[PDB]
């Protein structure tokens, strides 16, 4: 999954048969790091409120 944006740490739990996640489609917020199996979130590079 290629993209540009900042990542932080999330606390929601996935199902065993689920590896990705999109709270709203065309956002792709949720993903698991393969190396550490740490559940995270994918957010845009900066907040838009400028």
């Amino acid at each position: 999954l290629t993209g540009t944006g900042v990542l932080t740490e999330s606390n929601k739990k996935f199902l065993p048969f689920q590896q990705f996640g999109r709270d709203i489609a065309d956002t792709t917020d949720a993903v698991r790091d393969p190396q550490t199996l740490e559940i995270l979130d994918i957010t845009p590079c900066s907040f838009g409120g400028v």
Binding site: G3, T4, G5, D26, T28, I42, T43, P44, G48, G49
Partner: protein, 137 residues
């Protein structure tokens, strides 16, 4: 009805105040065994007044009553960031934006004009006079 055939509600020979329509002078509401009901239009209470030669009417009392009138004066401001809408968190963000971002720039200018209009709505309804007065005892 003249709009069409309505199946699911029962007609009544009485007349009640309409809240939601049907489309041919008929209206439906929740009324009592309780179920959905359909009634003809309420033209109103019927008042019998007699126009008569050389006759006049004058009130003995009068009543003072306050009524609620509600007018929504403003609507919630919204704005759209162009890059975060059409680009999102994707690569080639510069290439995606110079060709198609000015549509969003026009739409964001329209939304900014809407936001300015929404501020001006409450500004002109609430600050016709700009002299603030302390509360009297």
């Amino acid at each position: 009805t003249r709009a069409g055939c309505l199946i699911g509600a029962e007609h009544v020979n009485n007349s009640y105040e309409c809240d939601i329509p049907i489309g041919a002078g008929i209206c439906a509401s929740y009324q009592t065994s309780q179920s959905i009901i359909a009634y003809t239009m309420s033209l109103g209470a019927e008042n019998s007044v007699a126009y008569s030669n050389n006759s006049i009417a004058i009130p003995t009392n009068f009543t003072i009553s306050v009524t609620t009138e509600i007018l929504p004066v403003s609507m919630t401001k919204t704005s759209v960031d162009c890059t975060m809408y059409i680009c999102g968190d994707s690569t080639e963000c510069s290439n995606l934006l110079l060709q198609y971002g000015s549509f969003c720039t026009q739409l964001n200018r329209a939304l900014t004009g809407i936001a300015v209009e929404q501020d001006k709505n409450t500004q002109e309804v609430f600050a016709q006079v700009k002299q603030i007065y302390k509360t009297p005892p």
